[PDB]
Amino acid sequence: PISPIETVPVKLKPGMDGPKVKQWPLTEEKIKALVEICTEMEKEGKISKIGPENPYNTPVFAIKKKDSTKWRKLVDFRELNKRTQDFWEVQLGIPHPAGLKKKKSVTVLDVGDAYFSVPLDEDFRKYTAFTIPSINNETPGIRYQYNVLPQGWKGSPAIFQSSMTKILEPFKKQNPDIVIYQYMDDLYVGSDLEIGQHRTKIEELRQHLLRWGLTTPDKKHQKEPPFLWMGYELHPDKWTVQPIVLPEKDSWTVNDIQKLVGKLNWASQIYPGIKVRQLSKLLRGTKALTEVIPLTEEAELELAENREILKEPVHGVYYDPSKDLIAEIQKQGQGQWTYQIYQEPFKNLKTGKYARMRGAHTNDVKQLTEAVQKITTESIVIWGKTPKFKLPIQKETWETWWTEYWQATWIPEWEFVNTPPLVKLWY
Amino acid sequence: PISPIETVPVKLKPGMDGPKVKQWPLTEEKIKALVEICTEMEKEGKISKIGPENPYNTPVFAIKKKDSTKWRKLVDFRELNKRTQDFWEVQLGIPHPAGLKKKKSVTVLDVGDAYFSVPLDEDFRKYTAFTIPSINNETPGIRYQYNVLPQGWKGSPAIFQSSMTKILEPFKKQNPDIVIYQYMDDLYVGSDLEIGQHRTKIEELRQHLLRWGLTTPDKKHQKEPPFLWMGYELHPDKWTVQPIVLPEKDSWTVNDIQKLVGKLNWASQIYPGIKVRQLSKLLRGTKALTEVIPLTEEAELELAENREILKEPVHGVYYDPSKDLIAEIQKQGQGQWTYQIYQEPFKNLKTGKYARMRGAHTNDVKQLTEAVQKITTESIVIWGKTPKFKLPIQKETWETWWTEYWQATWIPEWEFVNTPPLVKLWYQLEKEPIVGAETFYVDGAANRETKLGKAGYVTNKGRQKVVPLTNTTNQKTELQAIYLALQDSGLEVNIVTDSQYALGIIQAQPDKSESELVNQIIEQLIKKEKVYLAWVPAHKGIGGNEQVDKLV
Ligand SMILES: Cc1cc(C#N)cc(C)c1Oc1nc(Nc2ccc(C#N)cc2)nc(CO)c1Br
Ligand SMILES: [Mg+2]
Numbered sequence: 013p014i015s016p017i018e019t020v021p022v023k024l025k026p027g028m029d030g031p032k033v034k035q036w037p038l039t040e041e042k043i044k045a046l047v048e049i050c051t052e053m054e055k056e057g058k059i060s061k062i063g064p065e066n067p068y069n070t071p072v073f074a075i076k077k078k079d080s081t082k083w084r085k086l087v088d089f090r091e092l093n094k095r096t097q098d099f100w101e102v103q104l105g106i107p108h109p110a111g112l113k114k115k116k117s118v119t120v121l122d123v124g125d126a127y128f129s130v131p132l133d134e135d136f137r138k139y140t141a142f143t144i145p146s147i148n149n150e151t152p153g154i155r156y157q158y159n160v161l162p163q164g165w166k167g168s169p170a171i172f173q174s175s176m177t178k179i180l181e182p183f184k185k186q187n188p189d190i191v192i193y194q195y196m197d198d199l200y201v202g203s204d205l206e207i208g209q210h211r212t213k214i215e216e217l218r219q220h221l222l223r224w225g226l227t228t229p230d231k232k233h234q235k236e237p238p239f240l241w242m243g244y245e246l247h248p249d250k251w252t253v254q255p256i257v258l259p260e261k262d263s264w265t266v267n268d269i270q271k272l273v274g275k276l277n278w279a280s281q282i283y284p285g286i287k288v289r290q291l292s293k294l295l296r297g298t299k300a301l302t303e304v305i306p307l308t309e310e311a312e313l314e315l316a317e318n319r320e321i322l323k324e325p326v327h328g329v330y331y332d333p334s335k336d337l338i339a340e341i342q343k344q345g346q347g348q349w350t351y352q353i354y355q356e357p358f359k360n361l362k363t364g365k366y367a368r369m370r371g372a373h374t375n376d377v378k379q380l381t382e383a384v385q386k387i388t389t390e391s392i393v394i395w396g397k398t399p400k401f402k403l404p405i406q407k408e409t410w411e412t413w414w415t416e417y418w419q420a421t422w423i424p425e426w427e428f429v430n431t432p433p434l435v436k437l438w439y
Numbered sequence: 440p441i442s443p444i445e446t447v448p449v450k451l452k453p454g455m456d457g458p459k460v461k462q463w464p465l466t467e468e469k470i471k472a473l474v475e476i477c478t479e480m481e482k483e484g485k486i487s488k489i490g491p492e493n494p495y496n497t498p499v500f501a502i503k504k505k506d507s508t509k510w511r512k513l514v515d516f517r518e519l520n521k522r523t524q525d526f527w528e529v530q531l532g533i534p535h536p537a538g539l540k541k542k543k544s545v546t547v548l549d550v551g552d553a554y555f556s557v558p559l560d561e562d563f564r565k566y567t568a569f570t571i572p573s574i575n576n577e578t579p580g581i582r583y584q585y586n587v588l589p590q591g592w593k594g595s596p597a598i599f600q601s602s603m604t605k606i607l608e609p610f611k612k613q614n615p616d617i618v619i620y621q622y623m624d625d626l627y628v629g630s631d632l633e634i635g636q637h638r639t640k641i642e643e644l645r646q647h648l649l650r651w652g653l654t655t656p657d658k659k660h661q662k663e664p665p666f667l668w669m670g671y672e673l674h675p676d677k678w679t680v681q682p683i684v685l686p687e688k689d690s691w692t693v694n695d696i697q698k699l700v701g702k703l704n705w706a707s708q709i710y711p712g713i714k715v716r717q718l719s720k721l722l723r724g725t726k727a728l729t730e731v732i733p734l735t736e737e738a739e740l741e742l743a744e745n746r747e748i749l750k751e752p753v754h755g756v757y758y759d760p761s762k763d764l765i766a767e768i769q770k771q772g773q774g775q776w777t778y779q780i781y782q783e784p785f786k787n788l789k790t791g792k793y794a795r796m797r798g799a800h801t802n803d804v805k806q807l808t809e810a811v812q813k814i815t816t817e818s819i820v821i822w823g824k825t826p827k828f829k830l831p832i833q834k835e836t837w838e839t840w841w842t843e844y845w846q847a848t849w850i851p852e853w854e855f856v857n858t859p860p861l862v863k864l865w866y867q868l869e870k871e872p873i874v875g876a877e878t879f880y881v882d883g884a885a886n887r888e889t890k891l892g893k894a895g896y897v898t899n900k901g902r903q904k905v906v907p908l909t910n911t912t913n914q915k916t917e918l919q920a921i922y923l924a925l926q927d928s929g930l931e932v933n934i935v936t937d938s939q940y941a942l943g944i945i946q947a948q949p950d951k952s953e954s955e956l957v958n959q960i961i962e963q964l965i966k967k968e969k970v971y972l973a974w975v976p977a978h979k980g981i982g983g984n985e986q987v988d989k990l991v
Pocket of ligand 1 (some may be wrong): 150532538539540542545547548618619620627628629664665667668673674675676677719772
């Protein structure tokens with residue numbers, strides 16, 4: 013009996029064969045990181061070297077821990093997940109509490125460290141194999157495969173779920189109002205206490221975990237505050253609706269009303285009860301464009317009218333847990349981006365906006381990689397599941413730089429879209 | 440001949456079981472031939488007579504091609520392979536010279552004798568069972584079973600390069616100056632010792648290997664300083680391509696036309712301006728392998744403009760991790776962009792081209808971006824870093840455009856390099872309507888079946904028109920409509936369209952498209968002083984299509 017456990021039999025869906033995803037190539041800097049990081053795991057027994065009989069292979073990267081001193085090995089078990097955890101989303105599902113989104117504040121801790129105690133079923137290992145590349149194909153890759161529930165594979169949480177609850181239970185006791193959600197590598201704790209208390213309640217938790225084996229690095233700083241922002245503190249009771257604003261104008265012109273007719277015109281299939289005709293009638297004319305013009309019969313009526321059915325959300329907008337979530341993002345420029353997370357067209361379960369800062373410090377491919385990790389987490393909280401991003405970037409560019417600013421332990425599903433039309437105006 | 444290397448345990452796919460095929464035609468002169476190689480084989484422990492009990496067979500063939508002093512044994516493991524688990528594929532790619540470090544002496548060893556020296560997973564042997572038919576009297580043929588990696592077996596190249604790497608590891612350590620690289624039947628060794636000291640190390644490596652049962656040769660028919668590596672002419676401080684051959688002919692065909700281009704590209708790694716848009720365009724005929732194709736004017740010129748280039752032999756230099764990596768890009772025209780990566784402004788490190796084969800409408804700036812990108816990938820793969828860029832575009836241009844564009848891009852560090860042509864914005868649509876300008880309400884339908892359309896406008900001034908077109912589409916008219924307004928408007932105009940199509944296409948500010956119409960439009964856009972476009976829904980917005988549609 014290995015000090016920590018005894019393997020939990022793992023079996024991928026029948027007719028399913030292990031992952032075989034190619035390894036993106038990397039920077040020498042990054043190879044060396046991984047090369048060191050792995051020689052460690054290697055030593056600690058965490059992982060071993062594999063032979064040619066292991067045709068399997070999942071990708072790996074190296075990222076900046078928390079803008080820290082050294083690297084982090086980030087495995088993209090996206091494929092092996094679909095192939096397993098989906099039936100461990102069943103055989104061992106981790107239930108998602110619909111109230112956490114309600115808490116006044118959710119802190120997010122990284123428990124990814126506990127897993128490395130639990131040895132992975134002796135037979136499934138072969139699947140968690142990855143390969144650190146080499147520059148200019150001069151050397152055959154380096155091949156390592158796991159021996160402990162690895163971080164990132166949506167199966168460790170499910171296995172460790174057992175032992176978690178147990179570790180937690182005697183805190184979920186003294187603290188029955190706080191909700192604790194486990195999602196892969198992280199714990200999300202919610203509370204309605206004034207922050208000061210919360211923060212403490214969190215550390216009150218952090219030490220509980222700690223004096224019980226688990227180690228949380230989440231110690232962002234100490235007494236000296238180099239204007240460095242404290243732990244992950246979301247506030248979901250402020251996770252409300254975004255603004256779709258028509259403008260109340262001093263003066264209206266053919267053009268203004270022209271565009272205005274458009275916006276409204278397509279909102280049309282978001283809310284099928286918006287009427288323009290009374291407005292679209294003043295443009296039936298072929299008048300100049302800079303020209304100013306006023307109302308119609310029920311124009312003003314229709315403006316403040318549709319101004320209404322607009323401020324009142326839709327219907328048939330219920331979440332389908334059986335379906336998949338979808339996040340569309342659009343650049344707004346000058347640091348602003350917007351997003352919608354639907355399941356079927358125009359039935360938006362939610363929308364928002366992300367904004368970074370001003371020039372000198374940020375580029376597009378940072379805002380997107382963050383707007384992404386933002387929308388992911390709202391999603392994890394709200395529905396207990398990350399979405400599939402319809403990213404407005406050139407596949408290869410993203411493929412090249414996403415790691416460059418990626419901080420999350422998990423990776424969503426994404427695809428690219430070269431066409432966001434009239435949508436930018438609208439939102 | 441055989442080593443004490445641990446063996447890679449092997450398995451047959453999930454449910455399957457070893458092959459039971461056979462072949463029994465006995466030509467005395469060959470049954471001898473085989474039993475010959477076989478006795479000298481078993482003797483060398485590479486195979487073993489097996490007692491009839493559960494074996495699975497496989498085809499035995501004898502061979503002697505040209506210059507046959509000896510015969511050659513050959514089993515067909517096709518049916519066995521189809522039953523063995525998959526392995527870890529190696530050699531997918533070849534190191535590319537442009538990123539090799541300058542080494543002095545070199546030596547390629549021959550390791551073909553190889554796979555016959557590495558052991559075969561003790562248990563997986565029963566399957567390798569083949570049978571050389573002995574007496575035609577249908578007598579229990581002399582039956583053997585392999586002990587080393589079989590020549591055709593699936594898991595052989597794999598289980599081999601494996602065993603290899605493991606054998607080099609130690610030697611690779613006590614000799615960090617001796618860089619090795621293996622590729623199949625070979626084992627190349629490069630160092631910075633003088634041809635003597637170097638032929639020492641080689642001997643040690645040589646011995647080292649031999650202790651591991653891997654026997655290597657001392658001489659055979661090969662060559663020296665140039666090296667013939669896969670398609671590369673390798674020299675001690677320069678590399679370059681093996682002389683290419685652009686064949687001239689009477690009637691050209693796809694098979695040829697392709698084989699030309701492919702040869703052409705390969706040259707590009709180092710021949711500065713190699714162009715290829717035209718010769719390739721001639722393959723829209725995605726079909727016929729023998730369908731002879733006319734080298735229609737445009738191509739020929741190009742091909743020749745390439746002959747003049749290959750015409751003068753040029754080579755390349757290596758990577759100096761100490762120095763900086765740079766990349767310059769120059770636009771050529773038909774959507775083609777050339778570049779070359781170097782550390783020193785004189786001879787090259789590697790060069791390349793980037794052509795936009797993505798459809799119909801594009802933009803110089805964007806393209807520039809796409810280029811940069813392409814390269815950054817390559818640079819990461821080859822050098823593992825990201826060259827500092829040198830590009831023919833000024834920040835007030837680039838920055839302005841990434842500011843407008845709806846998608847998000849990201850160029851790495853770059854330094855401007857003024858040299859014709861020059862990536863810029865030939866125009867900019869105005870953001871707000873024009874106070875005083877004539878408002879042209881364009882439009883123009885088309886008959887989907889009769890292929891008959893119309894295109895016209897109606898201005899605020901009450902200036903109208905409709906121009907008859909035949910052989911066109913709703914899209915073609917819709918643009919022609921925007922081309923009209925433009926034509927008949929003054930140096931300033933406010934244009935209004937219904938097609939999200941026509942609109943979009945104009946907004947991206949396509950530097951070009953061969954679609955002469957778009958061009959015609961594009962040019963008018965450049966000649967204008969100020970333009971303003973506006974999009975309004977089709978079947979229910981303004982009130983101007985109708986009065987012209989009712990006409991159509
Ligand atoms: C790619 C290659 C080809 C041949 C073969 N054949 C032999 C060797 C050992 C090779 O490896 C490397 N070669 C070089 N430079 C080199 C330069 C000139 C010549 C010549 N002539 C050969 C090799 N540098 C590195 C360093 O990274 C490696 Br690794
Ligand atoms: Mg129309």
